[PDB]
Symmetry: C4
Subunit: 331 residues, 4 copies
Amino acid sequence: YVSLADLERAARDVLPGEIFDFLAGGSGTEASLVANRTALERVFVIPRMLRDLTDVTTEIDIFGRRAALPMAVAPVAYQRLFHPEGELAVARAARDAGVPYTICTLSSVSLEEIAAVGGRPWFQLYWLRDEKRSLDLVRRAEDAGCEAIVFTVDVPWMGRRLRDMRNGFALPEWVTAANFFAPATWESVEAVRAHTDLPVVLKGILAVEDARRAVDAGAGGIVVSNHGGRQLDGAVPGIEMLGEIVAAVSGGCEVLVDGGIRSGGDVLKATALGASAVLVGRPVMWALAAAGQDGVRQLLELLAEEVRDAMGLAGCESVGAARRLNTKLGV
Amino acid sequence: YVSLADLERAARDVLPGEIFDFLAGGSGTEASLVANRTALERVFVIPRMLRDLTDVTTEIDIFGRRAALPMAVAPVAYQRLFHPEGELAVARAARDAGVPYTICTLSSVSLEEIAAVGGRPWFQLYWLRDEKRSLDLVRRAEDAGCEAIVFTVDVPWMGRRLRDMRNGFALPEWVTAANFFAPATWESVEAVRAHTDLPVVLKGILAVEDARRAVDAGAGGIVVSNHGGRQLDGAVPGIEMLGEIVAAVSGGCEVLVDGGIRSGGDVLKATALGASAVLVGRPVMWALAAAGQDGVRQLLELLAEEVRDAMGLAGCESVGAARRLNTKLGV
Amino acid sequence: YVSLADLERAARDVLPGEIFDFLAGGSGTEASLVANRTALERVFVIPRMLRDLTDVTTEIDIFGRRAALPMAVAPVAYQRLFHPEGELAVARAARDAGVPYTICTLSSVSLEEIAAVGGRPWFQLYWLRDEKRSLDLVRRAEDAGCEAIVFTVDVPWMGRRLRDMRNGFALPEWVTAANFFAPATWESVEAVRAHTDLPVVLKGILAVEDARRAVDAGAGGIVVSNHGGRQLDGAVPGIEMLGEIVAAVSGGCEVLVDGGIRSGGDVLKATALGASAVLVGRPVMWALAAAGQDGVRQLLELLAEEVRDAMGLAGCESVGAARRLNTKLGV
Amino acid sequence: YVSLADLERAARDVLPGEIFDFLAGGSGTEASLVANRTALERVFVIPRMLRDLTDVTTEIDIFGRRAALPMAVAPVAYQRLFHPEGELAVARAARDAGVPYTICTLSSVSLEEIAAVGGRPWFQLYWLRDEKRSLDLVRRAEDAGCEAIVFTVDVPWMGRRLRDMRNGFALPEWVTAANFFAPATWESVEAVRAHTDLPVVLKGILAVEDARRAVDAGAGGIVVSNHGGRQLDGAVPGIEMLGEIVAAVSGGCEVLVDGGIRSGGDVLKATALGASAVLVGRPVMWALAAAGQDGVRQLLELLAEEVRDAMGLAGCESVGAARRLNTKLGV
Ligand SMILES: Cc1cc2nc3c(=O)[nH]c(=O)nc-3n(C[C@H](O)[C@H](O)[C@H](O)COP(=O)(O)O)c2cc1C
Ligand SMILES: Cc1cc2nc3c(=O)[nH]c(=O)nc-3n(C[C@H](O)[C@H](O)[C@H](O)COP(=O)(O)O)c2cc1C
Ligand SMILES: Cc1cc2nc3c(=O)[nH]c(=O)nc-3n(C[C@H](O)[C@H](O)[C@H](O)COP(=O)(O)O)c2cc1C
Ligand SMILES: Cc1cc2nc3c(=O)[nH]c(=O)nc-3n(C[C@H](O)[C@H](O)[C@H](O)COP(=O)(O)O)c2cc1C
Ligand SMILES: O=C(O)[C@@H](O)C(F)(F)c1ccccc1
Ligand SMILES: O=C(O)[C@@H](O)C(F)(F)c1ccccc1
Ligand SMILES: O=C(O)[C@@H](O)C(F)(F)c1ccccc1
Ligand SMILES: O=C(O)[C@@H](O)C(F)(F)c1ccccc1
């Protein structure tokens, strides 16, 4: 594989159509899904030349841990849909690559089993029916060694997935929510923040004042995101809000972004717009479907090579230097 | 049906081509018809997160009545062209859905029969040869229980419908103007305003100063509209004038918009740009052609679900909150 | 024919390919040819409503004469290429329609014969080898009753017509320059201005300061034009310079525009951007090729109907009102 | 050949696919490769009329020598890949056309042999493992009569050429680096500047402050360039940075540009944006592949004719006048 696009083909070949559609699809007309890519393709980097590249490093420190790349694996529910080893395969490859892995509330392997793999696990929280059971998942995650709580805030309910509706898609009986819902509010965030010493990261922020409020609320990070175009159809891409959000929080929390990151060059664009790190979702599942743990390993090695390549070609010996790059929007 | 686009296909299958063309077409090169859709697709919403959604309501109060959605059925002439029950089928479904229905001057069932269905009927006025007969239609409408007069102001004459001209389209003899024309001016508006206690709504306003003058003239509302691209070919889409018009009237009248609204997400966009409500035209006729009253019921249920979905995903418990959303224009 | 596009098809059918290419083509990659259309399609009009349309008139006064439309037939060389009656057919139809006709220096019928048709003939000048012979053409034109000299200023030499080069196109022996070249300068303009009492109109102005200088030089008009994309490939469309040019000359001369005008709606756009009038080139030749004098008559009747339609739908009882319309650029 | 596009076809026919791909391709997704063309196509020139064109000249003085056009042949490695005479064929044609030829560090004929052809040779430097051997190439070039050192600064390493990777492309054994690498820094530039009296030209500058620093560092010129989209995928096109760079250096060095120049009109655009001259890469190799030295001669004659044509049509008797043209960005 010489690009991430190589893996999507392989995944399309092996996966049942309705499962590929569950993975690929978005809500409504998929306007926001498409816009995530459009928006990245309009960004051009202004590279710097003639700088010292003797020790280029793609490493970052985030939420108290070194990561090998400014990247984590996005939360993706029910990974056994894509390969029999599901979350274990992905978590093992992420660990070996030095990349944080986000364990889902709706994981198809229990969070404790996935955490036992080691590495840098984060835990993604969906708010439950009750504060006490929500906080129990959080406590489980913390007890198991997860190092951040990624509280997803853009799913008061699931968006309208028309591919799933037309396919009559349902979870096969051989996939379960192995850790076993209500709309979250700012009160829910405070309940979580008070219940853990772990950094709380709010995933799904797009409005500048919600980013500001996240910092005021004690969040250690946010993910600027429209949930891969799966939630509000017509939601602005995170990448188009990122610069304004980074300016507004002025270093008060980590600012991650996701949606359509498909190469090391895309990681560089995100960094140049001010992101601390990116999440990558669908491509990690393509790699998992295509070739299991080894597939995910190959994807992460490819991404690592592309990130180093893009950084050096842009004159950046560190991710902090890449954040100081300027950009120019094209057509 | 999981989207409005499902219904257009069914309508295309059942309707005679020249009738489908009468419905689908625009004037001239159909530049304004296409631009209505382009313009909506360029609008992205910036959703808010973590707000209280315990009692999301899509209801609005407009022209003295509660409506179930920020939506009314647009005036569409000669609905028996599309189904034998014509206006009665549509009016019944609108009533049952809690949506206002606009009875046309050129209705193929008399305005009194359609009003007898109940619900929230509005009446759309085309200015006639003479002030006295124009005012008679208005008086008929008011006597029959219509609750607003939608005075169409962008048809001094009918636009050049090239599909109709190439098809040699004419009303079949089995369709008549069951209520049975000159250019309207501001004097005509005043004649109507003086003749009724009902709110007068000027449909087809695009210039900011015409919106201002509408308020000065005593209009209770305007519809920002290029008549679905059927009148001036090259007229700006209403959605591209809406924000500027809403700012200029500064609460002095209701500001509705139409043209290309095809989903609950589109309703949300219109609301976020400042609209009080939208009108929906062609899709209601697709539903009527495809499946009569039941078809229109299904369309309105779908739209209601999509509007509630979009509002909640955008953090809006009410339509007023949706009007306070920000937007960002894309490419 | 219900549109100008109807006629192009007919012309394509009847004309030898190399002659159709001579007519349709532009210079270089035809970037400017295409951009003339792109640019018009991006312009949207903001129509006014509810104005008095009791006596809508499309007439204008220009260069001392009433014209039936804000339009003239552009200079097009060698019209016998397209029909045996050539310039006589076009001039007769223009006369009957009340539209000025521009007689070319490179006409295939002598300027005196074409002037004898009557109507409102203008004369287009290409600067010759010598001042004295140039001025002789001007004097011939004036003696024959031409009412303006349209001095073409964007052809120091003919552009690179790659269609013509690939076709090995040459004038057939049955077409001649019946009135029988060096780069023109501002000195040439002054020589012409001093030699005639007729208004001198500079055709091919695109730079704002060249428009200003044209007024200073005593021009009665300019045509803002990139010569239909036939001269500099990459020249900005006239329609994209028009508003800035109209503002800069501030009523000091008539400002016409051409390039891609293909409907009455396009005439309205040009007027709303500030043009006094438009020229129309290729469509008049399509009509000539398709059906001779009668074809040109039909085209001009169609354009007249479309101009009246567009004006009234936009709330304009006169061309001066249409010049006060606002516009909004789309995508 | 009536355009540069004629030659690409011929080259595609004759060259082995993997060699055509080596020539045509870019890095990554080829976003920057495509953007070079997009960016040029969006630029429109505002031509001037009625100026004296009695002695139009396309000549410029640059780096102490007259050149026949504001153009040089870009450095392209390993030209024997495209024709058996390789660099000798191209250098001979460039000499005969009065165009500088850039001899590459990775030339497939020795720099001394190519310099012996005569003409105006420049020498392109890739920084080597060691300062002393780097400076030896520079000294060789100067001894052999090269008149500028074009130090390529955007290749700390070669970009990711996915076409080459998928083709498994490697140099055939019949092509060698006949003159026989580490990342260059500003220290390397100073080492070169101190080692030669020749002007040093930094090729691959895109950031405005790198252009400023180039002048401060004693560079005689820069080439604003993204290396033909072959280095950082997502790097902004040089043509989109050119105007800002020209303003920032304020005459302190020559500012060249390359990337996608494919006609005399493109040369005019570059000049109007402020370039001193352009480089042309791939088209020169198309001509070489198609027809050897004679092919390159034909290409340069065509470009010369197109440049003269574009300049005169734009009212420019000199390249300095063309630099004073205004432009307008289109869609
Ligand atoms: C199949 C699938 C399942 C997902 N499940 C979750 C989830 O359980 N929790 C969550 O916060 N995001 C979930 N996401 C959203 C991703 O974390 C991410 O925001 C999105 O995929 C955008 O990134 P991408 O374009 O790289 O896929 C899911 C996305 C996909 C495609
Ligand atoms: C077939 C058809 C008939 C219409 N008849 C009327 C009419 O009688 N009066 C009126 O004011 N608008 C009329 N309209 C315009 C609509 O009210 C509305 O402005 C337009 O269709 C744009 O909305 P849409 O894109 O949702 O169809 C008609 C539209 C269509 C398509
Ligand atoms: C076949 C042809 C011949 C033309 N001959 C002349 C000419 O002799 N003199 C002139 O000033 N313009 C000439 N023009 C330019 C036109 O007057 C006009 O500027 C151009 O066609 C743009 O208008 P259009 O898009 O309506 O064709 C010619 C154009 C065409 C297509
Ligand atoms: C096959 C090929 C080889 C090249 N080799 C070199 C090189 O050795 N040194 C260099 O500075 N640029 C090299 N370049 C870049 C060119 O000098 C130039 O920047 C680029 O091709 C953009 O111009 P174009 O679009 O006219 O090809 C090469 C380009 C190509 C296509
Ligand atoms: O985007 C997703 O699929 C998840 O975030 C979800 F939580 F919304 C979800 C999980 C499982 C099935 C449908 C939606
Ligand atoms: O857009 C429409 O079709 C109506 O608004 C109309 F009034 F213009 C009309 C009604 C019937 C036939 C043609 C136009
Ligand atoms: O655009 C044109 O064809 C004319 O304006 C011309 F004068 F340039 C010309 C006339 C006849 C043949 C080629 C060009
Ligand atoms: O763009 C290029 O091909 C050259 O500039 C290069 F130096 F990068 C190079 C030369 C030979 C093989 C691969 C890259």
